[PDB]
Symmetry: D3
């Protein structure tokens, strides 16, 4: 669609602990996407259980929440055309065992419960997660100097 689509990208505590904050950001930076919001946070359990509210009945829900609480999280919002779908492709398959080398999980991850990062799965869930993690004023409005070279259209 348009060049101002947004998604929610989070670096899970294992990605922070293993020193992958820089490399993960570079994947989206080099691809041509724009970072409009970022912050390192340790959110409370209530916020994490709301982010994973659709999985509260899954058997792995309790362990996932405790692991998302075990360390700091680098929450981000990236902007660009098809940033939701292409962003998930940059992260690789949700299960690292099925991820392709060259993707983030294909280069860095093994277990699905330690798959380093999170990405919104749809445009609707991206807006939901952006409002859950960020105040509207935490999204900075700016235009990349190389916009006309990344994009042929708005």
């Amino acid at each position: 669609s348009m060049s101002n689509e947004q998604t929610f990208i989070a670096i899970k505590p294992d990605g922070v602990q293993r020193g992958l904050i820089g490399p993960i950001i570079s994947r989206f930076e080099n691809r041509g996407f724009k970072l409009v919001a970022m912050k390192l946070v340790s959110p409370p359990q209530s916020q994490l259980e709301q982010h994973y509210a659709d999985l509260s009945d899954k058997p792995f829900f309790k362990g996932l929440v405790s692991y998302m609480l075990s360390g700091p999280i680098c929450a981000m919002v990236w902007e660009g055309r098809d940033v939701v779908k292409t962003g998930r492709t940059i992260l690789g398959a949700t299960n690292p065992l099925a991820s392709a080398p060259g993707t983030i999980r294909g280069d860095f991850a093994i277990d699905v419960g330690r798959n380093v990062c999170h990405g919104s799965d749809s445009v609707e869930n991206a807006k939901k997660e952006i409002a859950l993690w960020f105040k509207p004023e935490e999204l900075i409005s700016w235009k990349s100097a190389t916009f006309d070279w990344v994009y042929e259209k708005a």
Copy 2:
């Protein structure tokens, strides 16, 4: 078969975004041999000759003025299946269908800003090479690791 040549060009957006080094390293690391290269600003006639097979498609007009909007790094790479493997390295022509690990899969988004161009066949490469380079610009040399890259041919 190892003397097969292809034409690889870095489009103005690739030059503008500072991608000359990483793109050349991608072919260097694969083991291909660079036999010709120049930073060029070709005339509009040569570009329309390059995209001659697409002169009636709707996107032809904007394609010419955008290839004219900046310098182009033209290259000729030599190696076994360098035409097919070269395009695989560049990734899918539309970056939305490209895979991470390829040039477009790591750097591009829009098809009109897909950073690079690669010949799609051996015969088209031979024509693009003749159009973009004069014969004296193809340098003849042998890589010191040629026998470690190739088992034969």
Copy 3:
């Protein structure tokens, strides 16, 4: 020198515009320093003037504040032994003309008015800048998994 010393590292708008957020973070990640606070901000001019209060009489002061307002800023707090001193060495000479390759400015910068990044030049100035740019709750407390492999003591 204790391992809990903190410093303030900021990626200036030219650093964000030129796609240097990833590599700059990786320089401090690979060295062994701990990121305890980070956020993408567009701070008000009063905060920027107060940050450069020592330079309010300098001739380049108004152009400096204006350039620091021209885009997003990645503000960071890094923690480690001698991180203030070593962080400045990682950034390189404030004038990139005098910086050495291998540092951030020796690799990416040219002009002193566009030197991509900022670093506190003293422990006490770091405490002042961290309190100026960050709220106390924005500094996340956590323990690196390889702490005992980076540090022999303290």
Copy 4:
């Protein structure tokens, strides 16, 4: 499928000659696998023929054995969950013509007879090759500091 599965990865003489020791090792280090054994060796021809015993009748056998004798080999044992299959995916397709960029052969190789590396194709074959190339005391036993961050279970 536990996290102590082991595989045999070897850097062939062409990979050694072309300076690919570091990059190949980084591919396995970054993914999260543990290196338990490594040594630069120029093994006798009988060991190489035993390694490729299932190919002793193939036409390219003597040319393959001579090529495996033409220089040093970096023999390695990597340990991790599903390291045999994922290791083969990291190396790429056996014939680099069919390999994907982002894998080892998709980034550095061209000819199948010069595919820079080898990896075990099954768990049982891995145990055969580990015993073939390594004496038992050459397997180093240790625990990564980030084990609980790479894996969610044993």
Copy 5:
């Protein structure tokens, strides 16, 4: 000031060892603008004229023969203080005295195989640029991040 130019050349050992990409990335990442580049095998007379200030040194004949042994990636980079900063990026001419982080400190050992060359002065840059490049081969363009690299002209 910002339109200063220097001559950077990747010597045959840099091309043979697959260092074209990494060397270009060093100047690209720093913020300098590539205005001219070509892969060329220049004649011996051009190389003897390039090192004319060394025709009395004993290593002169060996220097010319080794510069003839392979392709050379001749470049022209433009930027503020690009001559001096370019020399600093290359490192000490003798790699044993170069610091890691520079090109020679990362890739070279012997001074007779020091991978690259850079102009030592602004006026020697103009002579080397005019010797290696016709005026047409220099491309005039403006980087989209010029106002983010430089604060003033």
Copy 6:
């Protein structure tokens, strides 16, 4: 002064624990040096005390020996012109606080008790260390395909 000079480079347990094996090997590969011997070993305490015998009554000797036993070591022998002196320069200053960014320790280490790597400080000390760590048949004899492009003379 010749090109067959040899030195002993060892990646200490912290370098192995922090995933720096590949990057460190790449530093010497890129420079043009030749790896003639390498093995991952867990050496006995006597060999380590025999290795650091010239520090037998320094205050840090017992802790240094314990730290060298706390994990696997990647022991290497690199060969090239002035590899002993240039190797130490590549590693950086023994104390990472005094090392320059761009070197191994300037990029990766902080404490001298966790300085990641070790290099021989003289040609004579290198010969003693190489014989102390490696059996003579563990040194592989081979010539790089790019020798004449790295060296102008023998």
